[PDB]
Design a protein around this ligand. Structure first.
Ligand SMILES: [Mg+2]
Ligand SMILES: [Mg+2]
Ligand SMILES: [Mg+2]
Ligand SMILES: [Mg+2]
Ligand SMILES: [Mg+2]
Ligand SMILES: [Mg+2]
Lengths: 222, 204, 233, 250, 235, 243, 198, 237, 196
């Protein structure tokens, strides 16, 4: 996994690769690692996949209820506080490593959360097995006051470093852009530089190839 | 030892043109000892199909639990559960036992009865959803299955062709796994009808 | 005024009274007389025991709480058993944890606090017993009177139960004499036995009637009944 | 500290009445009128903002509430009871449904849960029933648009159109006369405005009337783009200005 | 919960009195099916007939109930009955025998009668069901937690009147179709309204499954009721 | 004496008498209070009556600092007042801990109204005989006034008043906003918004105030604070040089 | 190790269970009946951890007998085994799991068929023509794969069983002291008292 | 207890006040650097042991409490104050400020006016001491109401006590030393005993003073007590 | 981690480096280790980041509630709340905290709460893995009643050495100045402090 977060002048961008693995094996070649906590607060996770999704949905649910209750737009500091307190309680057993980014009435925010419940703030971050490849790109090209365009480019380039150099990362790049004035834009498969080449042969079998013992129609109704 | 390797077992699901297929072997073992030649691992709640591999006690338990939960759903909702919804129900049910999990690899197949779109999904033992549109594999021969499927698969296959592909994937993966095989069942699922076929295979 | 206000311990009367507590006080006045008094070196309990029948045992009024402490009872006897068990525990706790003999004053405070909770809880009744507690601690001999209202007072002498007003007036008059009775247990018991006589319409207090207890400087709390009281009748 | 009324405060009387439920229903009667009308392509729920003081800012007190992106509620009766029922309805939509099936409950099932919450205030120890009647309107994929009334006893009924509170009898009459199964949403909103003018004493404008619809999806209210299968809430509160526009051609 | 000097349970009796003001529900059992029919409580033009189920509920695939009393109390009990049927299915891998489900529900009602100081449920049930032990069955339960089995029964308003009518016309050798006629005639004779129209009825059957050897619960759509009301000559 | 007058169950008329009686308790202190919104502030004024000459005047107060940003003025007996204050302080601290931002005035008010609703529905709790007025300069909403009662009702106000002579002050203010046509006081300094508040109380009640007759709380961006007698004195001088 | 065999012929289910109880270096008993009757047409045999074995069996027996009296009816073999599997499935995740494997043989009167269920301590259930728990299956499954026919009589099944016990006596390292054989059919449960020299 | 009357009163609390008014009289006087507490102890009988039925209670080391009404209720309240003071000291390390302590007792007394299953306390409590920023004196009614005081009195002789207290506040506006305040407390207690002159009484004084006791609560005994009695005896005639 | 607090004539100063590591990897080079728990009460954290943040958040909650009810807490009160949390939970915590505060009465104060949950009042304190290398230096160069600039120099020099030798320390030197003034944030970059 490679996930990054990059702040620009009017907002924040997150990006992630699209490969999930079971040990050395690739299960999903194009899964979404970008997750919505609320409309303008988005989230990328590394670690125990079920944990990062569950912790996102739980806190997402509570953030909605809070928002409805208070009649306000959800803040990023609320997502962060609820996440860290929840993860802390579980003393690292919920293996959620998250980059949380978004915009709210108080501005734009970028945070990392570690599974034991510690948090950090920053202008650029990476997590996952590919975080070192991505950080080397970020440390090379990040500058203060980036345009939206520049920030998308940089985040995308960080994910590629992860994709090309880290065996834990691969396939495509997803981006989400959160700008202070606007609706958030989720950009599925922003890059697709890993198209499988056409196979040399077709493997469709002549019908009747498989030996069948018996057969029956299955009742679905009642 | 490893709870997911005691009993054996493989399940594979595939999508085609306006159809899905789901298949499993029939073996139930106890380590080296083969016990049952008739252990089916695929179940169906209305038009939603669920395969489960792993510890056989948990296979049985989860089948009974999902029969329970979908029966109630139908009574309250006054309609059969859809593939998408059921996928979510399996996920949260598994995650509910996060620190004492069922030792299973579930697989969901079916056609949404409103949109007509074919649907498959996979999970890990704690309910992390594998959302993939082509194939899903699970069990003690998952490596062999991934190999077969990535090689054999092409999209938009006619039900009669998809049948061959899924069967050939299952048979050959099973034959390279000591704990899988002993018979196999394949379901071709078309909106309107479902056909079930028992394959002829090596009995070693 | 007495109308809808004596239903529980959790209701004040328009006069600021707690009738359940006042009714509990009435079970004391119904009880058989007991006297307590002390000098600087000893403290004595004298009690008139009461039979149900001429075929029955007279029921005990005196309970030992520790080697240096004990009490007499007037009112509901089973309530005295509850409270003396608590007092026995408090004495015990103090010995075990602090290796310290419980001050008779602290025993008073503990009983007051326990009674109090029952004058404020719904569905619970107040205690219906009066107690006289005697002891010899690190500051000499002591006597206490306990009322189920939770009021505990330290006294040179007192009496509770039916017709006790007689004994009280006697002790009030005898004060300057008995406070000095030091190093003579038998004389103090005699002054106690005489005090309880002013509370007799009954009869002449027999070997079975009479219950005496003593504690002091070099005497553990000890109870005398039967033939052992004869020499005081 | 600790309850002395661990018994039911609602009990049956010799005649079979459940006293406290009747008395709560009388509290609904004294309440400001609210109403609901179901169209072919939407539902409208409407009510009056009877303000307590002209020094009060009536926009800070909504009588019309979103429960899910596709379900809204209105009430007649005791406001504060409504407010807490809304919180619990919002919560129960998540805890009993969304956290299980990853989607929002269909209207009938959510109404069912609210009804349950109200039923329990009718049987449990040491409580009085809720003093409100709710109208709940929503949409869901497999049932389409719907409208439900929920009463203090926990009873619920589906309606094509109804009214609760003060002048509900006259308003139901007015609705039976005007309703048909071919109504577009705009026709329903129009009827809702006409019906509500009979009830309203004072000013009748976009600042004293409160109106919401369950219509089509508002992708501009979603808050994000990029996911085609997500199209936005069907619940929409009409603005003061939007109301005044429909009162000119009234 | 307390007894009267007469040896009666006040709150239970008052709950029963409440039920006699609820719309009549009728259950009739025949050799090849069961009928459930119930009169909807004084409704209005604007009520949604199509998405309304106030008196008839499915408990599982083989068992249904007709309700008389408070609907919200009944939904409480129906929900636990549904759970109970599923627990049994999970435990034994067999559908629950009707009596077992009925006894359970009845025991829950009985509890409120005997401890806890909560009011009883103001509900009477007619249960209609099939199982492989007793075939077609009809039971009734009321707030006291008592239950009895019947060939034909009513609950709610006018039970006395409806019971006499059923006693007269019922015969052991009936087919379901004759039982359909009997239930509607009886509701027609006993209504406190002018006519017994479709919009004021709920109707259901449990039959031998059109053509199969299996069992099917048909909950009648409003249009179906309108037809079956003409057939029997009440229009 | 029917049960419907002793606990919070419905009367045959759908009323809750114990709630109604709790409203009557709110006036038992015979103190009046009013709140107004400035351009970037919110001001609460309450009468301060110290009849007994044995009392320490500094400890007699019906204004509370709930948090750095929220103040609360109470109309009702002090014991119930302090109960509500303690709860609001705890609720405010807890909100900040759990959600990572300061509890808004309106949200605290909604929460206290919710608690009051409960006492309205459960038999073992009596309602608190108080009316709570919450003020702040909300970071999202600007100057704010929210007021909760024993019914669990709450709303936001342009300005508001509470106490036995509530109506006098209310119509005085209603008449002002009729004239100005805006929903706050134009004025940049909190000191002049405080003077407006004192001035209009004087007209409405038809009474003069010394520095010891008054109690003042001011909410600005991020503080809420009360005024000492001397700050109030300075305010009384300024009004006198014109009015 | 504890021999537990079952075989389902056409009209009966035959259970055979070893008679030895061995602790350490001593055979304490050579006549142990590793069985409880659950209902007139259902028999259960068991093997595993020393105490658990009988405690589980008796607990199950109590529960089925309770059902029978409450309902005045006998549960089908399928239902009894489902209930048994559930109990074991709950046990495996509890504080101390019942370490017991069982065979269930029943005659279903409603279907007129014999039925054999094999359930291990985890709650793994399967319906089988023949089954075994422990090491014994490592010999008998293959033997019966060869010799077993679906249309056999009770006498043919007893011969098939004799063959299984002979093999175990020949190849198993432990002296299990012969078996107690029980037949379950329409006329109930009976013990074949002659097997140690039949 | 939880019952509001039709005019918003609580009759139960009003009745609890009658129990207080029935009680012995007790007072508190705030001096320039501390606080003085004094109480009337009725001598029911000669048999009561002198100096040995102590009414004034310490809480922590720097707070005294005196009360009138149901004595056991006052003890119940003081036990709670001690638990409450220990818990503050445990977490915050510093001994509890007097206003902080006042509210603790306040909230606790108020709780007993919320529930039908409890009665209000039948005492008024006068209490206080020295903290980080000076002396404080408080009086607490059965309703949970409390304020700061310059001087406080409760119980049977409250009216005359308040009148003598008011005079001191008038003749000494310039802050009344700890040593004067003790003398005056003895006087005031003597002057409220006029009502209950049928039975004899014993005087108890305690004080907490910055310069006189180092901010700790101490009992006035020995020569200091006798001197205060003599002053009161002289000024009564 | 290198963290310290120093009392001086006008108050107290806290300093820290900005490096956080997991193994030899710098997870954050610009961390803010100086944590405010009240307006003029700050702390430096060492040990488990999860633990010390969770603790600092709870203390901040307690001090906010304290301020609502009772007024400004003393620095001692802050330190006591930290201890309570650290002592009572010694068996699931790896937390070393230094508490620094200013009030008008007590002036500038420093408390250190090492691993066990003990409390120590000190004229100055140093902690974190980097501190071991500067015990000699600090003891030799610290004086009481130093000026602001002198104290700033002492911390700058001390932490630059701690940074020089400790691999787990580095980045920028942050400081917080606590006086009557005022809260003042200071920062010093490598190009300045390495040349010392
Ligand atoms: Mg595998
Ligand atoms: Mg194989
Ligand atoms: Mg209440
Ligand atoms: Mg109450
Ligand atoms: Mg007084
Ligand atoms: Mg370094």
């Amino acid at each position: 996994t490679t996930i990054v977060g990059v702040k620009f002048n009017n907002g924040v961008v997150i990006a992630a690769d699209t490969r999930s693995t079971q040990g050395p094996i690739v299960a999903d070649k194009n899964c979404a690692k970008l997750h919505r906590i609320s409309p303008k607060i988005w989230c990328a996770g590394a670690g125990t996949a079920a944990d990062t999704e569950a912790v996102t949905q739980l806190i997402g649910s509570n953030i909605e209820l809070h928002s409805l209750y208070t009649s306000r737009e959800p803040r990023v500091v609320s997502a962060l506080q609820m996440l860290k307190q929840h993860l802390f309680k579980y003393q690292g057993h919920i293996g959620a490593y998250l980059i949380v980014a978004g915009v709210d009435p108080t501005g734009s925010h970028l945070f990392s959360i570690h599974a034991h419940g510690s948090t950090d703030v920053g202008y650029y971050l990476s997590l996952g097995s590919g975080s070192l490849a991505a950080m080397a790109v970020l440390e090379s090209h990040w500058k203060q006051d980036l345009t939206k365009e520049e920030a998308i480019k940089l985040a995308s380039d960080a994910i590629q470093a992860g994709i090309w150099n880290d065996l834990g990362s691969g396939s495509n790049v997803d981006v989400c852009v959160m700008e202070i004035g606007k609706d958030a834009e989720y950009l599925r498969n922003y890059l697709t530089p890993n198209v499988r080449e056409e196979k040399q042969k077709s493997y469709k079998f002549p019908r009747g190839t498989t030996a069948v013992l018996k057969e029956s129609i299955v009742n679905i109704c009642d | 030892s490893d709870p997911s390797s005691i009993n054996g077992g493989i399940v594979v699901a595939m999508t085609g043109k306006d159809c899905v297929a789901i298949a499993c072997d029939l073996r139930l073992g106890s380590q080296s000892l083969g016990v049952s030649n008739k252990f089916e691992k695929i179940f169906h709640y209305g038009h939603v199909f669920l395969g489960i591999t792993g510890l056989a006690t948990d296979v049985t338990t989860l089948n009974e639990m999902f029969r329970y939960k979908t029966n109630l759903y139908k009574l309250k909702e006054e309609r059969a559960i859809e593939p998408e919804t059921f996928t979510q129900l399996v996920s949260s049910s598994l995650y509910e036992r996060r620190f004492g999990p069922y030792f299973v690899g579930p697989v969901v197949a079916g056609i949404n009865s409103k949109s007509g779109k074919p649907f498959i999904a996979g999970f890990d033992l704690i309910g992390c959803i594998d959302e993939a549109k082509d194939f899903i594999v699970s069990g003690t021969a998952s490596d062999q299955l991934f190999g077969m499927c990535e090689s054999l698969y092409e999209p938009n296959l006619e039900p009669e062709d998809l049948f061959e592909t899924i069967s050939q994937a299952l048979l050959n993966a099973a034959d390279r796994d000591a704990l899988s095989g002993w018979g196999a069942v394949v379901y071709i699922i078309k909106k309107d009808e479902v056909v079930k076929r028992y394959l002829k295979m090596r009995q070693d | 005024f007495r109308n809808n206000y004596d239903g529980d311990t959790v209701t004040f009367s328009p006069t600021g009274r707690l009738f359940q507590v006042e009714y509990a006080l009435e079970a004391i006045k119904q009880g058989s007389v007991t006297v307590g008094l002390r000098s600087n070196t000893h403290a004595v309990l004298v009690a008139l025991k009461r039979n149900a029948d001429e075929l029955s045992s007279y029921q005990k009024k005196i309970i030992k709480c520790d080697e240096h402490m004990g009490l007499s009872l007037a009112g509901l006897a089973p309530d005295a058993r509850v409270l003396s068990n608590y007092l026995r525990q408090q004495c015990n706790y103090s010995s075990l944890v602090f290796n310290r003999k419980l001050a008779v004053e602290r025993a008073g405070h503990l009983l007051c606090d326990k009674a109090q909770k029952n004058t404020q809880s719904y569905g619970g009744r107040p205690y219906g017993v009066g107690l006289l507690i005697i002891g010899y601690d690190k500051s000499g001999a002591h006597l206490l009177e306990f009322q189920p209202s939770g009021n505990v007072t330290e006294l040179y002498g007192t009496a509770i139960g039916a017709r006790s007003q007689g004994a009280k007036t006697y002790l009030e008059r005898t004060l300057d004499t008995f406070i000095k009775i030091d190093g003579n247990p038998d004389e103090l018991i005699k002054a106690g036995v005489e005090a309880i006589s002013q509370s007799l319409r009954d009869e002449s207090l027999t070997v079975d009637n009479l219950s005496i207890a003593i504690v002091g400087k070099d005497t553990p709390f000890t109870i005398y009944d039967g033939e052992a009281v004869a020499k005081y009748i | 500290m600790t309850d002395r009324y661990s018994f039911s405060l609602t009990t049956f009387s010799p005649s079979g009445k459940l006293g406290q439920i009747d008395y709560a229903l009388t509290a609904v009667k004294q309440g400001v009128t609210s109403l609901g009308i179901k169209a072919t392509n939407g539902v409208v729920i409407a009510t009056e903002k009877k303000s307590s003081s002209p020094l009060a800012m009536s926009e800070t007190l909504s009588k019309v509430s979103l429960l899910t992106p596709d379900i809204g509620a209105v009430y007649s009766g005791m406001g504060p009871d409504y407010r807490v029922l809304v919180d619990k309805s919002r919560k129960v939509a998540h805890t009993s449904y969304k956290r299980i099936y990853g989607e929002y409950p269909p209207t009938k099932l959510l109404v069912s849960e609210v009804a349950k919450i109200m039923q329990e205030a009718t049987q449990s120890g040491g409580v009085r029933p809720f003093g409100v009647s709710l109208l709940i309107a929503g949409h869901d994929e497999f049932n389409g648009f719907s409208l439900y009334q929920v009463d203090p006893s926990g009873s619920y009924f589906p309606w094509k159109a109804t009214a609760i509170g003060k002048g509900s009898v006259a308003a139901k009459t007015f609705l039976e006369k005007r309703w048909n199964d071919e109504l577009e949403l705009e026709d329903a909103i129009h009827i809702a405005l006409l019906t509500l003018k009979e009830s309203v004493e004072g000013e009748f404008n976009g600042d004293t009337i409160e109106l919401a619809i369950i219509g089509d999806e508002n992708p501009d209210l979603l808050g994000y783009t990029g996911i085609p299968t997500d199209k936005g809430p069907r619940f929409r509160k009409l603005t003061s200005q939007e109301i005044n526009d429909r009162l000119e051609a009234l | 919960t307390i007894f009267s000097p007469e040896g009666r349970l006040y709150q239970v009796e008052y709950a029963l009195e409440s039920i006699s003001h609820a719309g009549t529900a009728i259950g009739i059992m025949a050799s090849d099916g069961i009928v459930l029919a119930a009169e909807r409580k004084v409704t209005s033009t604007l009520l949604e007939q199509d998405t309304s189920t106030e008196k008839l509920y499915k408990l599982n695939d083989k068992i249904a109930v007709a309700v008389a009393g408070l609907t919200a109390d009944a939904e409480i009990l129906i929900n636990t009955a549904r759970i109970h049927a599923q627990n049994y299915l999970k435990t034994y891998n067999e559908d629950i025998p009707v009596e077992i489900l009925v006894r359970r529900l009845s025991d829950i009602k009985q509890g409120y009668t005997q401890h806890g100081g909560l009011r009883p449920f103001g509900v009477s049930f007619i249960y209609a069901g099939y199982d492989d032990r007793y075939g077609y069955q009809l039971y009734t339960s009321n707030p006291s937690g008592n239950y009895t089995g019947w060939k034909a029964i009513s609950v709610g308003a006018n039970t006395s009147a409806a019971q006499t009518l059923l006693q007269m016309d019922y015969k052991d050798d009936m087919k379901v179709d004759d039982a359909i006629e009997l239930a509607l005639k009886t509701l027609s004779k006993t209504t406190d309204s002018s006519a017994l129209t479709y919009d004021r009825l709920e109707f259901a059957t449990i039959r031998k499954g059109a053509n199969d050897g299996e069992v099917y619960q048909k909950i009648f759509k409003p249009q179906e009721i309108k037809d079956i009301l003409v057939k029997t000559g009440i229009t | 004496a029917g049960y419907d007058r002793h606990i919070t169950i419905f009367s045959p008329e759908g009323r809750l008498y114990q709630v109604e009686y709790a409203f009557k308790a709110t006036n038992q202190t015979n103190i009046n209070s009013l709140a107004v919104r400035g351009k970037d502030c919110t001001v609460v004024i309450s009468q301060k009556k110290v009849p007994d000459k044995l009392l320490d005047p500094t400890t007699v107060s019906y204004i509370f600092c709930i948090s750095r940003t929220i103040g609360m003025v109470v109309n009702g007996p002090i014991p119930d007042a302090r109960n509500a204050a303690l709860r609001a302080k705890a609720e405010a601290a807890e909100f900040r801990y759990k959600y990572g931002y300061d509890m808004p005035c309106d949200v605290l008010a909604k929460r206290m109204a919710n608690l009051s609703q409960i006492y309205t529905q459960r038999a073992y709790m009596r309602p608190l005989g108080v009316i709570l007025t919450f003020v702040s300069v909300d970071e999202e909403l600007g100057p704010s006034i929210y007021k909760t009662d024993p019914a669990g009702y709450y709303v936001g106000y342009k300005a508001t008043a509470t106490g036995p002579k509530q109506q006098e002050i209310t119509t005085n203010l209603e008449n002002h906003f009729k004239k100005s046509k805006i929903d706050h006081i134009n004025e940049e300094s909190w000191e002049k918004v405080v003077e407006f508040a004192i001035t209009h109380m004087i007209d409405a009640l038809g009474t003069e105030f010394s520095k010891n007759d008054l109690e003042v709380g001011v909410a600005t961006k991020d503080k809420f604070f009360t005024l000492s007698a001397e700050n109030i004195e300075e305010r009384l001088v300024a009004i006198a040089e014109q009015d | 190790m504890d021999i537990i065999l079952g075989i389902r012929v056409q009209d009966s289910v035959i259970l055979a269970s070893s008679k030895a109880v061995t602790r350490g270096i001593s055979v304490l008993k050579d006549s142990d009946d590793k069985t409880r009757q659950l209902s007139p047409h259902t028999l259960m045999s068991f093997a595993g951890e020393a105490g658990d074995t009988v405690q589980f069996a008796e607990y199950i027996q109590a529960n089925i007998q309770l059902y029978s009296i409450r309902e005045d009816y006998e549960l089908s073999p399928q239902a009894v085994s489902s209930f048994v599997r559930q109990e074991l499935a709950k046990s495996i995740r509890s504080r101390r799991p019942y370490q017991v494997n069982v065979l269930i043989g029943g005659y279903d009167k409603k279907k007129n068929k014999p039925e054999l269920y094999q359930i291990d301590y985890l709650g793994t259930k399967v319906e089988l023509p023949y089954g075994a728990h422990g090491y014994s299956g490592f010999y008998t499954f293959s033997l019966l794969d060869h010799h077993y026919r679906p249309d056999m009589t009770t006498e043919e099944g007893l011969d098939l069983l004799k063959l299984c016990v002979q093999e175990l006596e020949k190849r198993m390292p432990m002296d299990f002291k012969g078996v107690i054989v029980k037949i379950v059919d329409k006329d109930g449960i009976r013990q074949v008292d002659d097997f140690q020299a039949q | 207890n939880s019952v509001f009357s039709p005019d918003g009163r609580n009759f139960q609390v009003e009745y609890a006040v009658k129990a207080v008014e029935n009680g012995t009289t007790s007072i508190g006087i705030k001096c320039n650097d501390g606080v003085v507490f004094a109480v009337e102890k009725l001598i029911t009988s000669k048999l009561l042991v002198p100096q040995k039925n102590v009414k004034i209670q310490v809480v922590d080391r720097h707070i005294g409490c005196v009360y009138s009404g149901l004595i056991p209720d006052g003890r119940h309240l003081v036990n709670r104050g001690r638990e409450e003071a220990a818990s503050f000291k445990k977490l915050y390390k510093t001994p509890i400020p007097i206003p902080a302590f006042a509210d603790r007792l306040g909230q606790y007394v108020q709780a007993h006016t919320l529930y039908n299953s409890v009665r209000p306390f039948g005492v008024s409590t006068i209490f206080g001491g020295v903290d980080k920023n000076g002396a404080h004196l408080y009086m607490l009614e059965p309703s949970g109401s409390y304020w700061g005081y310059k001087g406080a009195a409760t119980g049977k002789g409250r009216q005359s006590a308040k009148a003598e207290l008011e005079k001191l506040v008038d003749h000494h506006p310039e802050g009344l030393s700890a040593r004067e305040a003790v003398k005056q407390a003895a006087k005031i207690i003597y002057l409220a005993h006029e009502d209950n002159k049928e039975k004899d009484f014993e005087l108890e004084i305690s004080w907490c003073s910055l310069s006189e006791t180092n901010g700790l609560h101490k009992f006035v005994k020995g020569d200091l007590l006798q001197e205060a009695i003599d002053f009161a005896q002289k000024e009564i005639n | 981690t290198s963290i310290m607090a120093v009392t001086f004539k006008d108050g107290v100063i806290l300093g820290a480096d900005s490096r956080t590591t997991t193994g030899a990897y710098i997870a954050n080079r610009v961390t803010d280790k100086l944590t405010r728990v009240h307006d003029k009460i700050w702390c430096c954290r060492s040990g488990s980041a999860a633990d010390t943040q969770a603790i600092a958040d709870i203390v901040q909650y307690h001090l906010e509630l304290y301020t609502s009810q009772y007024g400004t807490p003393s620095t001692e009160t802050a330190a006591s709340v930290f201890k309570e949390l650290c002592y009572e939970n010694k068996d699931n915590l790896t937390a070393g905290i230094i508490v620094a505060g200013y009030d008008d009465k007590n002036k500038g104060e420093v408390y250190t709460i090492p691993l066990g949950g003990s409390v120590h009042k000190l004229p100055y304190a140093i902690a974190g893995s980097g501190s071991t290398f500067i015990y000699g230096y600090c003891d030799k160069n610290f004086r009481e009643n130093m000026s602001k600039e002198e104290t700033v120099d002492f911390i700058k020099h001390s932490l630059s050495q701690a940074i020089k030798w400790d691999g787990s320390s580095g980045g920028v030197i942050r400081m917080v100045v606590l006086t009557a003034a005022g809260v003042e944030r200071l920062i010093f970059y490598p190009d300045e402090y390495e040349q010392l």
